[PDB]
Scaffold this active site. Sequence first.
Site, PDB file in Angstrom:
ATOM      1  CG  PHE A  60      54.180  39.074  41.847  1.00 24.59           C
ATOM      2  CD1 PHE A  60      54.626  39.068  43.044  1.00 24.59           C
ATOM      3  CD2 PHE A  60      53.614  37.708  41.106  1.00 24.59           C
ATOM      4  CE1 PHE A  60      55.079  37.625  43.626  1.00 24.59           C
ATOM      5  CE2 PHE A  60      54.157  36.500  41.775  1.00 24.59           C
ATOM      6  CZ  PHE A  60      54.813  36.575  42.886  1.00 24.59           C
ATOM      7  CB  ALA A  61      55.804  43.650  37.118  1.00 21.92           C
ATOM      8  CG  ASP A 150      50.918  49.571  43.334  1.00 19.96           C
ATOM      9  OD1 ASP A 150      51.531  48.571  43.956  1.00 19.96           O
ATOM     10  OD2 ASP A 150      49.661  50.096  43.854  1.00 19.96           O
ATOM     11  CB  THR A 182      38.948  45.911  56.624  1.00 17.65           C
ATOM     12  OG1 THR A 182      40.270  46.044  56.163  1.00 17.65           O
ATOM     13  CG2 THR A 182      38.394  47.548  56.880  1.00 17.65           C
ATOM     14  CD  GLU A 240      45.547  44.205  53.372  1.00 17.91           C
ATOM     15  OE1 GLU A 240      44.491  44.804  53.396  1.00 17.91           O
ATOM     16  OE2 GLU A 240      46.358  44.803  53.089  1.00 17.91           O
TER      17      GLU A 240
HETATM   18  O1  LIG Z   1      46.925  43.575  37.024  1.00 14.27           O
HETATM   19  C1  LIG Z   1      47.396  43.425  38.234  1.00 14.27           C
HETATM   20  C2  LIG Z   1      46.988  43.417  39.327  1.00 14.27           C
HETATM   21  C3  LIG Z   1      47.957  43.374  40.520  1.00 14.27           C
HETATM   22  N1  LIG Z   1      49.325  43.183  40.436  1.00 14.27           N
HETATM   23  C4  LIG Z   1      50.500  42.859  41.249  1.00 14.27           C
HETATM   24  O2  LIG Z   1      49.517  42.898  42.591  1.00 14.27           O
HETATM   25  C5  LIG Z   1      49.815  43.871  43.666  1.00 14.27           C
HETATM   26  C6  LIG Z   1      48.780  44.263  44.398  1.00 14.27           C
HETATM   27  O3  LIG Z   1      47.725  44.821  43.698  1.00 14.27           O
HETATM   28  P1  LIG Z   1      47.417  46.528  43.868  1.00 14.27           P
HETATM   29  O4  LIG Z   1      48.941  47.198  44.077  1.00 14.27           O
HETATM   30  O5  LIG Z   1      46.666  46.756  42.520  1.00 14.27           O
HETATM   31  O6  LIG Z   1      46.538  46.358  45.062  1.00 14.27           O
HETATM   32  P2  LIG Z   1      46.422  47.840  46.010  1.00 14.27           P
HETATM   33  O7  LIG Z   1      47.765  48.253  46.758  1.00 14.27           O
HETATM   34  O8  LIG Z   1      45.729  49.044  45.054  1.00 14.27           O
HETATM   35  O9  LIG Z   1      45.610  47.643  47.095  1.00 14.27           O
HETATM   36  C7  LIG Z   1      50.406  44.931  42.593  1.00 14.27           C
HETATM   37  O10 LIG Z   1      51.299  45.780  43.478  1.00 14.27           O
HETATM   38  C8  LIG Z   1      51.450  44.218  41.692  1.00 14.27           C
HETATM   39  O11 LIG Z   1      52.468  43.790  42.464  1.00 14.27           O
HETATM   40  C9  LIG Z   1      49.725  43.100  39.045  1.00 14.27           C
HETATM   41  O12 LIG Z   1      51.126  42.799  38.850  1.00 14.27           O
HETATM   42  N2  LIG Z   1      48.933  42.957  38.264  1.00 14.27           N
HETATM   43  O1  LIG Z   2      40.541  47.802  54.203  1.00 13.21           O
HETATM   44  C1  LIG Z   2      41.827  47.166  53.749  1.00 13.21           C
HETATM   45  C2  LIG Z   2      42.127  47.921  52.286  1.00 13.21           C
HETATM   46  O2  LIG Z   2      42.469  49.219  52.461  1.00 13.21           O
HETATM   47  C3  LIG Z   2      42.684  50.190  51.315  1.00 13.21           C
HETATM   48  O3  LIG Z   2      43.057  51.403  51.932  1.00 13.21           O
HETATM   49  C4  LIG Z   2      43.694  49.264  50.362  1.00 13.21           C
HETATM   50  O4  LIG Z   2      44.057  50.142  49.474  1.00 13.21           O
HETATM   51  C5  LIG Z   2      43.253  48.075  50.304  1.00 13.21           C
HETATM   52  O5  LIG Z   2      44.261  47.263  49.293  1.00 13.21           O
HETATM   53  C6  LIG Z   2      42.990  47.239  51.482  1.00 13.21           C
HETATM   54  O6  LIG Z   2      44.275  47.208  52.325  1.00 13.21           O
HETATM   55 MN   LIG Z   3      49.503  48.263  45.766  1.00 11.08          MN
END
Ligand SMILES: O=c1ccn([C@@H]2O[C@H](COP(=O)(O)OP(=O)(O)O)[C@@H](O)[C@H]2O)c(=O)[nH]1
Ligand SMILES: OC[C@H]1O[C@@H](O)[C@H](O)[C@@H](O)[C@H]1O
Ligand SMILES: [Mn+2]
Length: 291
Positions: A60-61, A150, A182, A240
């Site tokens: 997803f982007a 990302d 968590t 998650e």
């Molecule tokens: O504005 C946004 C926020 C989220 N994502 C999608 O949702 C995923 C999960 O969100 P993110 O990577 O921000 O969560 P994190 O890894 O920092 O917990 C991203 O990898 C993208 O694939 C996106 O496309 N646009």
């Molecule tokens: O505690 C759960 C969380 O842990 C962070 O490290 C992560 O960036 C979140 O996206 C979520 O997985």
């Molecule tokens: Mn991510």
Amino acid sequence: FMVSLPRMVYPQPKVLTPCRKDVLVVTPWLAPIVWEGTFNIDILNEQFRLQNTTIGLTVFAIKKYVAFLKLFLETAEKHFMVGHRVHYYVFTDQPAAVPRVTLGTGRQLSVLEVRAYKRWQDVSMRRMEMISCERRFLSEVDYLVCVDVDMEFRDHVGVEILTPLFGTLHPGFYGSSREAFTYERRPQSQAYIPKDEGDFYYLGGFFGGSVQEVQRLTRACHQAMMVDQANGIEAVWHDESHLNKYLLRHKPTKVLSPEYLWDQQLLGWPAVLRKLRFTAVPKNHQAVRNP
Ligand SMILES: O=c1ccn([C@@H]2O[C@H](COP(=O)(O)OP(=O)(O)O)[C@@H](O)[C@H]2O)c(=O)[nH]1
Ligand SMILES: OC[C@H]1O[C@@H](O)[C@H](O)[C@@H](O)[C@H]1O
Ligand SMILES: [Mn+2]
């Protein structure tokens, strides 16, 4: 039907020597945990090529996250399922912003336009609904692999992951006791896991399996999220949290080690990790997730 493997010459596996003594390599329900040193990729590539396996990769982007596609796709081309048939599905609200990446033979990309949601929580959560594109995946691929954008591939991510249903150990919790995971802890949430339950903390950002099992998983997590919404509760870690509850109650047939999703900036490079295969790209949370 599965034809015979051809003659192959490789190191004999020895029963009286473990591949790895430092880590758990099978779960108590007899699912492999995939670490470097546990698999002969030559044998696995054979078994999967003989089946002419096609792997779909969803990503997803949305909004500003289109910026991550170029490095994500170019490194997928270097390291993801190379030699196998691959169909990337890029879900985005900006089809014109998808970079033109040159692909290896046998690999294809489809751009699927979807609505953007304001709240990054909703963008993340609604992946489950958008994945569960139902007749399309069934006709085009054998397995689906669903990852965050990302990220970049740094090393081999190949057919050793394929299995009816897999999750990935979250790189921040693979060493923790279950009381510290968590998980969603409020009993009013469909995602609730009590403090004395739980096998592992899996990541929202890397899961997959056969088309059938991924559709089940994504449909179940989408229905659970819809019940929580109706009840005015939003799981502590969104999609998650629900994925964790699903994999608790439907055990995955393989688990990927944290080699498969790591953040070197936050966690370094421990000796227990022989390879860092798919890793977080630095980002500013507050700026990238808002206009
Ligand atoms: O504005 C946004 C926020 C989220 N994502 C999608 O949702 C995923 C999960 O969100 P993110 O990577 O921000 O969560 P994190 O890894 O920092 O917990 C991203 O990898 C993208 O694939 C996106 O496309 N646009
Ligand atoms: O505690 C759960 C969380 O842990 C962070 O490290 C992560 O960036 C979140 O996206 C979520 O997985
Ligand atoms: Mn991510």
